[PDB]
Amino acid sequence: DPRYTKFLTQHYDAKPKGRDARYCESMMRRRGLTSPCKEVNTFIHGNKGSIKAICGANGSPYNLRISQSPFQITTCKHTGGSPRPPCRYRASAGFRHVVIACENGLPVHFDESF
């Protein structure tokens, strides 16, 4: 599923070098989210298998699913004015449960509003 691949591209970074504004400004472009500037985007860290398992045993219904375990995350939030690149961001490192959408056994969307 290229959707799951795309989920990992947009919402997964296993061992982040940092968790600050510059990490975000780097990651948002690296991961294809700056044409144009995506307003809010969370990267989940840690082991990939725990995220995928939100679709099963590490999840409960929430058409969405909420994680039964917490995750190191970094939320990138646009700043600077209008959403023309180059995209400025600030970062909020977090440790919490997350909500995702699963389809046919795999994560395909991350729910930022949660």
Place this chain on the structure above:
Amino acid sequence: DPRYTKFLTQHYDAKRDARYCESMMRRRGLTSPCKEVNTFIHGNKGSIKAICGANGSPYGENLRISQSPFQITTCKHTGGSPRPPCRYRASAGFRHVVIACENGLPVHFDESF
């Protein structure tokens, strides 16, 4: 970021002798007058940046030390005049480096090491 871009100019060269040093020290603006000692870090720039984060660790006062070692070239001035033309000899090295960071970016290299 001026401080970060100055760090790269003065202390970073991605891809190792006296002539290396003599041209590099000049090309990177460290020869008016002659800087006595200056080290270039070689290798992957992300690895160096990461010293401020995952790949480094707190050191002394307000500094940080690399967790892995880096190939380095230290240029040492030769001759009696502190003015250019600046001649240098090279010490190729392999070791941990100490830097200072500001906002997750390298801004200073510690030559006493």
